[PDB]
């Protein structure tokens with residue numbers, strides 16, 4: 001099946017022995033994801049596998065989806081091993097790891113307002129692409145983005161809901177939801193769409209603007225929906241330019257139809273500071 005002449009050929013299928021498997025990534029925070037080396041390229045990779053013994057079809061579904069998407073700001077599929085168990089999905093490795101930790105740990109002279117704007121812009125580009133292709137993310141947040149060289153940011157989906165410890169994800173409607181990132185219509189009506197990703201993007205924008213603070217700080221999960229329904233929204237973070245906060249507020253429109261498209265959001269990021277410096281706005285606000 002590995003030869004192009006074969007009727008069973010799949011360009012994505014790679015030789016398992018081409019990859020040298022190292023340790024589990026990030027202590028175990030990603031489940032069954034391992035650091036790897038793709039031998040012939042001397043390239044470090046991330047390798048997702050299945051744990052011993054119905055989630056097989058979900059895994060294969062993920063591999064199929066990843067074959068359909070290609071964008072500079074979406075984590076890139078490099079290959080799979082899905083002919084026989086154990087199944088692998090191989091992606092590029094991103095030097096600086098997840099964006100949430102990166103924000104919390106970064107040198108702030110380096111990761112200035114300009115860099116933060118670039119990170120937000122890149123994420124909106126990935127999401128504009130997903131929007132165009134009629135995909136939904138379903139769990140957009142800083143914890144699901146990666147950071148590489150020169151502040152490159154890629155959107156990922158690590159399937160965190162039943163891995164992550166703590167109260168980021170909590171029980172809701174038979175599953176685990178990240179309540180503070182979840183659009184109200186998703187919480188209340190189980191309605192997910194690109195517009196519920198827009199809501200989540202607004203929360204992610206707030207994470208960027210605060211260098212990774214936890215959203216709705218000090219507010220009980222039990223109160224989030226009621227507060228949002230009564231028009232409460234997180235306040236503008238310290239130093240946040242008004243035009244950026246306006247964009248956050250647009251993402252958090254109660255009616256999903258009133259929220260901007262990711263194409264509109266990306267355009268806004270390109271125009272917002274075309275003639276003016278984000279550094280100057282932050283300074284003005286402070």
Ligand SMILES: Cc1ccc(NC(=O)c2ccc(CN3CCN(C)CC3)cc2)cc1Nc1nccc(-c2cccnc2)n1
Nearest residue numbers: 030033046047048089091093094097135136137138156157
């Ligand atoms: C090894 C692997 C296997 C699969 C995936 N998959 C994805 O990241 C992903 C992204 C977008 C989609 C699109 N999808 C559309 C439909 N909706 C419902 C879900 C999202 C699907 C999968 C990533 C990885 N990469 C990965 N995983 C965990 C950790 C890391 C990692 C950690 C630290 C440094 N560098 C890399 N890297």
Ligand SMILES: NC(=O)c1cccc(-c2cc(Nc3ccc(OC(F)(F)F)cc3)ncn2)c1
Nearest residue numbers: 112113116117120208209238239240241244282
């Ligand atoms: N040391 C300081 O002067 C100080 C104190 C508090 C906040 C900040 C601060 C805020 C800040 N905010 C900020 C920057 C960019 C931004 O746009 C985007 F979200 F990234 F798109 C939205 C908000 N950027 C850089 N520094 C600095």
Ligand SMILES: [Cl-]
Nearest residue numbers: 134135136137
């Ligand atoms: Cl989808």
